[PDB]
């Protein structure tokens, strides 16, 4: 069907993932895409799986810690998590 992760399908969309990001008027930086998604994220121990998700209930979570009050927040981080919840409320067909 693929069981690929939502990671690897939205490095394999790559491009399409900045045009939703710019969308949002942001812009994202795959590396930092993949550290935050599988390294900084699982962290927080709010949920969020080291291969990504679109679930929008597990995106609000990690959106609520980015957006927390310094210092308990990662502004760095906004941008990133921003672009995963419009991929995820708007998404293109790739999914």
């Known amino acids: 069907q693929t069981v690929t992760t939502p990671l690897s ?3 394999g969309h790559w491009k399409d993932v900045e045009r939703i990001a710019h969308n949002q ?3 994202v930086k795959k590396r930092r895409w993949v550290t ?4 900084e994220w699982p962290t927080f121990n709010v949920g969020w ?3 990504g ?3 929008r ?3 609000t979570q990690v959106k609520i810690k980015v957006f927390s009050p310094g210092p308990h ?3 760095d981080q906004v941008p990133y998590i921003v672009t995963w919840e419009a991929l995820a409320f708007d ?3 790739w999914v």
Do not use: K
Request: net charge negative; proline share 20%; with cysteine.
């Open 49 to 51: 799986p080291r291969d």
């Open 25 to 27: 008027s942001v812009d």
């Open 9 to 11: 399908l939205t490095l």
């Open 53 to 55: 998700t679109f679930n």
């Open 36 to 39: 935050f998604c599988s390294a």
């Open 73 to 75: 927040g990662h502004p």
């Open 57 to 59: 209930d597990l995106i």
């Open 91 to 93: 998404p293109p067909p």
